[PDB]
Design a protein around this nucleic acid. Structure first.
Lengths: 302, 302
DNA sequence: AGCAATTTAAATAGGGAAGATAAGCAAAGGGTTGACGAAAGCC
DNA sequence: GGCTTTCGTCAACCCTTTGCTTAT
């Protein structure tokens, strides 16, 4: 009794977004996709840090990788492909009598609600992040298996009920609960303005000669595959005292806020996984969380 | 109590101006816009260092970038779009406790007066800097949400009463004290003269083959987006011995003056924000300073 | 069908912001390489 | 009378993890 985790238990990605490519179009003609480019401005500023107050009367010179829309183009086009591969409960590391019993304990999970909020975040354009502020109207074109879907007025933090998101959901939930793959060809149009600053994912640079280093693909401004995939899995409204959706993590970690919303109150992924393999009746909002971390992937052993 | 600021606390800018362009028009016909082309002249000057009195018997040859009005056009047109986005009190980095008991510490702040001085600095033409001097009349055309506004004779230093910079500020203080965005599409007509010198923002150069590199956008003369945004925030008239408006900075620093007005005498932002969070009754003229800094953004941690 | 002039000077200064993190697993094999000396069939 | 094969005897660790100079 008391079935424990395998020492090496890990799961693969079942949501596989590509790197987003940032293009400039207009709101009328969306086919002449001018590619925005990361430029390098060197910016004079002020030294305002919380510790040093005697360094206040000095400037700081920080060269910054910047990405702006061209002044003749008023719409940012964010183009990426999201790949919803199947075989969620199968582990790429470990799994004997644990992954196979987690399969039989996560069999009756609401995958329709799980894959709905997975493609709602795609449809409502949560993957844009800072590209959403100041946008007049965000238009999202999704081209999955020669079917084009268009979304304009979707409120992001409230997962509302519309027909078209529930129609990409029933072809993704069939894969996530089954076997195969479904790829969505996402195209995000937002009317920011002429010359408005677009916001790619900044890169980690250790030493650097640049204060900002923006992600580039052949010099064109781009977003990380992990930044796009972060907002797609921002479906967790099932944590304790839930107000806003958070990204599914094994500890519900929001490191940008510095607070873990799933750790220390017996509601984290590992405790519910142990209860599921040991025989605890998982709640549906917790069963969805456990099978949503298996779609996120990660190492769940140790 | 003494709830400390988080190590990673940061707000984003809620004033997002595009990098300004520079066009050349006439005062009567304001629609035949040409592009102010940044040229490259080579001066022959004097070596006039404070030291080296043994010099200035030799020459000084430097090549600089110059942008001048065409001699058939007597009016410089400076075009940019200011984006006043909302959700000011929500921090991109950090959040919870310190940010949330500062959002509910800055809630009776006079947001009308803040947005009053914010759009009066886009109406008095303070975003033009050295393009202001020598102008006969600086006429500003601000078009927001399909109603244009014209301003021609506003005093730049005195925030005086005007009924049409207050109607714009009503659309801005309904955004800055809430959620959403608004976009002022600003045009700046100044009757400088025929063939006069316009003054774009100068780019920082490290290699420095040139001695003065003006900012260019595909050859067009241009001002930096952080330079236009620097003069929008020049609203701080509530420090010790206030004479002229400076930009709101966390220390009240003017790097071109070498002094910091708010730093040191217990009125800079960090020792005002900490007092507002901890429970000190903030004055109105310092509450607007703190939320003007939150509109400006920056790191406010550690 | 070669000829293209010389000197002279190339800017002084001020700024290059810090705060966070940098995973935990589990594996890492043995198989030959023995010389001296003493039973024990064997020329 | 050696002599040449094969079996029988006798054991027991503590390890360390790049420069040596460096061109007529």
């Amino acid at each position: 009794t008391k079935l424990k985790a395998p020492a090496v238990l890990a799961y693969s990605r079942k949501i596989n977004p590509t790197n987003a490519l940032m293009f400039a179009v207009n709101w009328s003609d969306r086919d002449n996709t001018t590619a925005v480019m990361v430029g390098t401005k060197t910016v004079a500023g002020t030294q305002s840090v919380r510790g040093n107050p005697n360094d206040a009367d000095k400037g700081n010179i920080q060269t910054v990788n910047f990405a702006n829309l061209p002044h003749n183009k008023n719409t940012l086009l964010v183009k990426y492909n999201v790949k919803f591969v199947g075989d969620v409960f199968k582990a790429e590391l470990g799994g004997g009598e644990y992954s196979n019993t987690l399969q039989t304990a996560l069999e009756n999970t609401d995958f329709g609600t799980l894959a709905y909020r997975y493609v709602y975040n795609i449809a409502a354009g949560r993957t844009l992040w800072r590209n959403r502020v100041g946008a007049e109207s965000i238009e999202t074109v999704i081209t999955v298996n020669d079917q084009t879907f268009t979304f304009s007025d979707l409120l992001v933090n409230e997962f509302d009920e519309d027909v078209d998101v529930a129609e990409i959901a029933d072809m993704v939930a069939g894969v996530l609960s089954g076997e195969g793959f479904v790829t969505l060809k996402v195209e995000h149009y937002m009317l920011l303005g002429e010359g408005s600053e677009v916001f790619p994912s900044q890169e980690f640079v250790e030493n650097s000669k640049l204060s900002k280093q923006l992600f580039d693909l052949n010099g064109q401004a781009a977003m990380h595959d992990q930044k796009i995939g972060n907002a797609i899995r921002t479906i967790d409204t099932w944590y304790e005292d839930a107000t806003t959706p958070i990204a599914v993590e094994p500890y519900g970690s929001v490191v940008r806020n510095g607070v873990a919303y799933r750790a220390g109150n017996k509601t984290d992924l590992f405790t519910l996984m142990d209860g599921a393999v040991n025989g605890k009746s998982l709640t549906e909002e917790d069963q969805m969380f456990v099978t949503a971390n298996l779609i996120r992937g990660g190492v769940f052993g140790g």
